[model samples]
Target: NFMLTQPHSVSESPGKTVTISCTGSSGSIASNYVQWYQQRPGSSPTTVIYEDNQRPSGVPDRFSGSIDSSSNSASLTISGLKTEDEADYYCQSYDSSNHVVFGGGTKLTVL
Candidate 1:
C-alpha cells in the first residue's frame, strides 16, 4: 500500500500565494501519475492538477503543480489566492500495490 501526505492546514490572505506539498512512495511518485484536487466545503472536488503538472481545461492559470522525482514528492502552487479559494486540497496517485491512494486533505484558509 502507498499513501500521500499533505500539510494539515495553511493560512494566507487574498492575492497571496500558497504551496502545498505532497509526498509519496516510489511506487506512486516515481512510476505513476500524480493529481491534485480542490473541494469547497460540501461541493464536489475539482481537478486542479493531473498527470503531475497538467491542468485540466477551465482550471485557472493561477494554480500550478510540479513533481520532484528525486524526492518522490509533488507540489501544488496557488498564486493570487482568493476567498473562494479557501477549501480543502487533496493529492492523489496510483500505487502499484494499492491501486489508488489519496492524501489526508489540506484546508486552505483565506484570511
Candidate 2:
C-alpha cells in the first residue's frame, strides 16, 4: 500500500476554512485523478471533488481539490465552513494498476 493521510482530524470554527491533505506513492497520485468525498454522520458519502477539482452537479463551489504531482499528494479545501461541514473527508485515487485506493479519513469538527 502506498497511500495514507496525515493529521487525521482538524477543528475549525464556523465560517473558517479547513484543508485536509492526502499523500500517495508514484503509482497513485502521480498517474491518477484524485477524488474527494464528504461523509456526514448517518448519511452516505457524496463526491465533492473528482478528477482533481471538478465538482459533481449539486456540490458546492466552496469545496475544492488540488494535486501536486511532484509531491505525490492531493488536498481538499473547504471554504466558508459551516456546522453542516462538520464531517469526515476522504481522498481517493487510482493506482498504476487501476486499483482504487483511499486515504485514511479526516474528521473535521466545527466549533
Candidate 3:
C-alpha cells in the first residue's frame, strides 16, 4: 500500500497564502492524477484542486496545485484567504488499494 506523507503544513496571513505539500510513497503518484480536498466542521470534503493543479469546472483559480514527479509531491496553495478557507486540507492520489487513503488533513487556520 502507498502512503501519503505531507511534510509541510504552513500557516499564512489572512490576505496571503500558504502551501501545503502532499507527498506520496514510491509508485503511488507516478501518474498525472492527484486531487486535493477541503473539509469543514459539518460538511463532506469537497474537491478544490485536481489533475496536477487543474481545477474542476466552475472552481476558482484562487486554489492551485503543483506536482513534482521526482518526489511525487502535490503542493496545494490556496489564496484570497477567507474564514471559510480555514479547514482541513488533504491531498489524495488514486489507489489500487481499492480504498481511499488521505494524508493527515492539514489544519489551515487563517491568521
Best by lDDT: 1
Check candidate 1 and list the clashing pairs.
Answer: none
lDDT of 2 by residue, 75-101 (tens): 777788899888888778887787787
lDDT of all predictions: 0.80, 0.79, 0.74
Any idea what lDDT model 3 has?
Answer: 0.74
Q: Please state the error at residue 54 of candidate 1 in Å.
A: 1.2
Candidate 1: list runs displaced more than 4 Å: 25-28
Clashing pairs for model 2 are none
The best-first sequence of candidates by TM-score reads 2, 1, 3
Report lDDT (Cα) of residue 111, candidate 1: 76
**Candidates in order: C-alpha RMSD to true structure:** 1.8, 1.6, 2.4
Question: Highest TM-score among the candidates is held by which one?
Answer: 2
| Model 1 C-alpha lDDT per residue in residues 9-74, reported as the tens digit of each score | 888888778898888844437577788888998899988878875786886888888877777788
